Design a protein around this nucleic acid. Structure first.
Lengths: 149, 219, 49
DNA sequence: TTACCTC
DNA sequence: CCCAACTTGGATGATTTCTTCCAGTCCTGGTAA
RNA sequence: CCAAGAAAAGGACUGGAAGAAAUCAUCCAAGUUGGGGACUAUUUUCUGCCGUAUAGGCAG
């Protein structure tokens, strides 16, 4: 997997191979460095007004012969017809009129904000930020009101 | 138009005011299905570690591609037609539109998406070049007082569409507990109409009719 | 037992003798442009029929 | 702490 | 460059249109005593 | 100060079995394309020598 980023300030970043970068650990040289530079652009954008910033993120995937792809799924009613699909996938209309597979904005978003490893003084894996510390995999909550957290 | 005006006004010391706003439609795609709410509601207030879903609504959503032509006016005799102001016009641009998310054209193919004209002849000439499959939306003349009158008007034309136009008051503004800011009033939705005009029709109508009829305002 | 046979035959013929291949099953046409009797063919790897 | 209802 | 461009007689007959058995869930309401 | 402000639909699959479109059938008749005409112009390739020599090499 290769990742490439351009921004409105003229910078460009390139990860030659993203498959090994962990949450916890230390990155290889000429990768750790790009993380520092990107951090600076964003740290500013987040807090100082009157700066226009805009980013364009592309990636490439090397695949198998006929590999299956997993786009976002729609939320639906059960059809009563038996001629209508029970599992329907999300697509986007292209400028030429054809449809293409896509991933929804809020699904990209939920991934980007998965940064909370501040709970219970034991980092584990990070959670999607939520007022109550919701844990979807275990169907529970890590900052239950009863704890004061 | 107004949230955009307020943001720009906090950046430029001179008074800036928007008389009119125009709307053009290049792409319109209907999206099926409905959004799932975040689990923001505890199943029980105390001694329960289960999270419930607030409820579900049935709405309709779409993706747009559109251009705007805003009539900008500066009260002061001396104006600021400079690169600095073009940057400030890019910064002031809101991120929210019609409940959805607004973005500029993609970076890898960027051109000057934020130009300014002080000549009707140059601006109209460039606008006549737009693709034939798009729509300009114009204000209508007809006065309708019922759905039956609307049915007849729509049977006769092919360019006429109903639109939501604003609100009609049920009472005079008063002070009321729970108001976000100042006075509060109840209202019912106002249903009105508009026309859909092809780029080919204004290539022939001329700049005179376009700048007289093609711009919308409040009141 | 994986048994195969390969059967070939040779026909010694007349000068321009007519040949009788399989026909297709068709419905009565009314365009007056399509043949009323249509024959079955195969496509070769090089495009010839 | 319990149940009661829209073609 | 320049001048022409065609009438006519006609467009099918027989009988048939198949079968077996199935059709999944689960989390997602206010209101009262 | 945009019916305002925030939102992860996710998980599992095995439609298979058999088959024969045939019989015949005829496109014919005549017909006239046709008369005229500057590719050389303000262009460059001219003069001697070696050599049995319209071979093959050199000075202007």
């Amino acid at each position: 997997t290769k990742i490439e980023i351009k921004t409105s300030l003229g910078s460009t970043y390139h990860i030659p191979d993203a498959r090994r970068l962990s949450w916890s650990g230390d990155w290889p040289e000429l990768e750790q460095k790009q993380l520092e530079q990107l951090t600076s652009e964003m740290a500013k954008a987040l807090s100082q007004p009157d700066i226009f910033w805009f980013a364009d993120v592309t990636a490439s995937l090397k695949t198998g012969f006929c590999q299956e792809i997993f786009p976002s799924q729609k939320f639906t009613e059960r059809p009563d017809d038996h001629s209508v699909a029970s599992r329907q996938l999300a697509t986007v209309e292209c400028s030429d009129g054809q449809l293409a597979a896509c991933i929804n904005p809020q699904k990209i978003g939920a991934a980007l904000q998965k940064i909370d490893d501040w709970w219970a003084n034991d980092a584990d894996l990070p959670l999607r930020v939520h007022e109550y510390g919701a844990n979807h995999e275990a169907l529970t909550a890590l900052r239950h009101p009863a704890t004061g957290q | 138009c107004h949230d955009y005006e307020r943001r720009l006004q906090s950046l430029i010391g001179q008074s800036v005011y928007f008389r009119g706003l125009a709307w053009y439609l290049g792409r319109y795609s209907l999206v099926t299905g409905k959004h799932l709410p975040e689990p923001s509601k505890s199943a029980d207030p105390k001694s329960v570690s289960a999270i419930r879903r607030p409820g579900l609504l049935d709405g309709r959503y779409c993706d747009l591609g559109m251009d705007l032509i805003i009539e900008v006016h500066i009260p002061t005799g001396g104006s600021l037609p400079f690169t600095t102001c073009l940057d400030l016009l890019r910064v002031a641009l809101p991120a929210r539109f019609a409940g959805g998310c607004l973005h500029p054209p993609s970076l890898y193919e960027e051109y000057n998406w934020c130009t300014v004209y002080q000549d009707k002849s140059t601006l109209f000439t460039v606008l006549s070049r737009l693709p034939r499959y798009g729509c300009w939306i114009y204000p209508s003349d007809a006065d309708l007082r019922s759905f039956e009158e609307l049915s007849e008007a729509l049977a006769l034309d092919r360019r006429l569409r109903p639109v939501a136009t604003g609100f009609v008051f049920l009472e005079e503004p008063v002070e009321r507990a729970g108001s976000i800011e100042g006075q509060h009033v109840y209202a019912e939705s106002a249903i009105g109409t508009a026309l859909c005009i092809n780029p080919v029709e204004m290539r022939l109508a001329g700049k005179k009719r376009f700048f007289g009829a093609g711009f919308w305002q409040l009141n």
